[PDB]
Amino acid sequence: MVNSFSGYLKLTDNVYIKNADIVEEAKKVKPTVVVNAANVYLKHGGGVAGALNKATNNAMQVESDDYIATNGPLKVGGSCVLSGHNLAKHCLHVVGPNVNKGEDIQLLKSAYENFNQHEVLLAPLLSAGIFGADPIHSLRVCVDTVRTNVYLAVFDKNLYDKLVSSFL
Ligand SMILES: Nc1ncnc2c1ncn2[C@@H]1O[C@H](COP(=O)(O)OP(=O)(O)OC[C@H]2O[C@H](O)[C@H](O)[C@@H]2O)[C@@H](O)[C@H]1O
């Protein structure tokens, strides 16, 4: 399919980036898949997760609570596909490593590998916020791992400007 993604800078054959709120991009484009930067408990408190969940009027959290009750926590580096509610067809919840809490940064590659199961994704930079991975590192792992088409929404203007001026 052709989506209405607009205003993205090309990074590579398959990776595109924009200074935008992922919630607003999802609302406008209604992509097949929006990626959440989750924790293993799917407790969507802040950052991307909290903003996505609020935009679903808490439906994402209610669904997530049922998922955990049935299946238990995700693995670090793991994922699950749930509804995208009013934002997207699906939300791919992906758990990057919580580097600030001692988890292995190498698991960020495993996390991004989940994206390869989907032809097109709207996504954030995993682990680059409250989980404490260096943002440029997360971008480089994304570029070096994801082979499907990924549209990265970077909320923070200062960060975007730095990332797009950095080697990959
Ligand atoms: N609305 C947004 N749109 C786009 N990018 C955003 C947005 N909000 C933040 N970012 C950027 O998105 C990037 C990721 O920041 P984070 O969302 O913290 O994800 P993590 O993987 O580091 O931490 C996961 C925890 O975050 C939640 O609390 C979860 O529930 C988890 O517990 C940063 O560059 C942000 O500037």
Side-chain angles (χ1 to χ4, degrees):
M1 86 180 290
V2 168
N3 287 114
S4 64
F5 293 111
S6 71
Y8 287 74
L9 178 70
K10 192 169 177 61
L11 297 183
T12 68
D13 175 58
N14 66 299
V15 180
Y16 298 88
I17 194 163
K18 185 180 182 181
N19 182 195
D21 181 347
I22 199 171
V23 172
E24 292 307 315
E25 289 293 301
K27 284 167 55 173
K28 183 259 152 162
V29 176
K30 204 177 284 302
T32 306
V33 179
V34 64
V35 175
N36 183 29
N39 59 64
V40 296
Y41 305 110
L42 302 179
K43 285 178 164 164
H44 305 306
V48 169
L52 289 171
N53 176 56
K54 185 169 175 202
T56 76
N57 201 18
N58 210 49
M60 176 178 287
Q61 189 65 67
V62 171
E63 178 193 32
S64 292
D65 288 353
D66 171 79
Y67 175 91
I68 296 289
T70 297
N71 299 293
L74 296 180
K75 302 173 172 167
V76 180
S79 68
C80 66
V81 179
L82 290 174
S83 179
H85 303 279
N86 53 318
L87 301 177
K89 182 169 190 324
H90 303 291
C91 179
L92 179 69
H93 296 271
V94 180
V95 181
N98 187 348
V99 174
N100 283 331
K101 291 295 262 221
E103 298 180 350
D104 177 9
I105 186 56
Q106 290 174 124
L107 292 166
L108 188 57
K109 187 170 184 74
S110 305
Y112 278 114
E113 286 171 341
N114 295 296
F115 289 28
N116 291 320
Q117 300 297 315
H118 303 277
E119 290 189 3
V120 181
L121 314 90
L122 170 62
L125 291 172
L126 301 175
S127 296
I130 202 168
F131 277 3
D134 194 14
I136 186 57
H137 180 64
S138 182
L139 178 58
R140 287 175 182 149
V141 177
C142 180
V143 160
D144 292 341
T145 305
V146 182
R147 297 176 302 282
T148 55
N149 292 323
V150 59
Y151 290 83
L152 294 168
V154 174
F155 182 90
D156 188 286
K157 177 180 180 301
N158 287 333
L159 177 57
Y160 175 89
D161 291 345
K162 181 187 200 185
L163 292 173
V164 303
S165 64
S166 298
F167 70 81
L168 296 169

